[PDB]
Write a protein that binds this ligand. Sequence first.
Ligand SMILES: CCC1=C(C)c2cc3c(CC)c(C)c(cc4nc(cc5[nH]c(cc1n2)c(C)c5CCC(=O)O)C(CCC(=O)O)=C4C)n3C
Ligand SMILES: [Mg+2]
Length: 306
Amino acid sequence: KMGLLVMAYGTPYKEEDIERYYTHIRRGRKPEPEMLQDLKDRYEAIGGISPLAQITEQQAHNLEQHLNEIQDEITFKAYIGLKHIEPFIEDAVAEMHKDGITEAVSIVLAPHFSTFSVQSYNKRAKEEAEKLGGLTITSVESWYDEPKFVTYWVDRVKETYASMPEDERENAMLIVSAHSLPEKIKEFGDPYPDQLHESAKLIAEGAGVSEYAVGWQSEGNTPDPWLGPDVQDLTRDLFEQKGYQAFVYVPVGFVADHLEVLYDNDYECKVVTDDIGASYYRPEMPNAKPEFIDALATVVLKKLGR
Ligand SMILES: CCC1=C(C)c2cc3c(CC)c(C)c(cc4nc(cc5[nH]c(cc1n2)c(C)c5CCC(=O)O)C(CCC(=O)O)=C4C)n3C
Ligand SMILES: [Mg+2]
């Protein structure tokens, strides 16, 4: 029986947990009253926070189920480990250890590798495992290039373009994005930017979409500069240059209908498209769909030489 450590940034499971979540993100400092209310309002704006955390749970549960279904050599047991929400990464490793797991494979629910979003999680997981002893973790570092994942987005893009009216179909711009990170990741030779670019190329080329651009979104508010351009500004700049009648957003860096997609794209990017008179398109996120889960299972098996 092998452990399957599924990690992610995390989202509050209950509305009452938002402040604590924010505090964790701010490394021990409670958010200012208004700052807190603003975040609460965004969750409200997208229909409520309750559904969100459940997607990650379903992704982990479905992945476990699928992996035990498609092959009969290994019996996987999933453990979710989150960065800012309990169960925390260390606690997940602690439970695997307590459960008797001696070997585990880990995967982060973010296809592109980055020092802040994949490496830090893997590092924290392995250090805790080392500390407890008798537990070896093999970690997936990036999977944006898994053919099945690329195909998922390629098909979603094909469907969207094939369904647009003529005026729009030949005057559209595809914007491929991921979550922005501080520019200082460059001090570590972080390939994150390169991977998003390759991810965009693979998808646009597979879909036969010639007009596309790479952008970043959801940057946090700190004194340091984050990766740009932001999808909002990119959309406007491109419209000003070519006057596109439609924009298709593929937030490939994200795997589910969370705040970044439902708000930063579906609301903020549509505000821009609405403002310049262009149509807004944003294909279905992977969430816990069978096609996506099978892509993840493949990534895990390949990592294990299976
Ligand atoms: C890529 C995954 C990712 C997601 C999703 C994410 C989400 C997110 C949320 C949830 C809506 C909130 C309230 C904030 C909002 C924020 N997010 C961060 C800080 C970060 N946010 C980060 C990453 C990150 N943040 C990283 C990495 C940092 C730390 C960067 C660094 O070390 O300098 C801050 C700064 C908090 C502080 O004051 O320390 C705010 C605000 N972020 C951007
Ligand atoms: Mg924002």
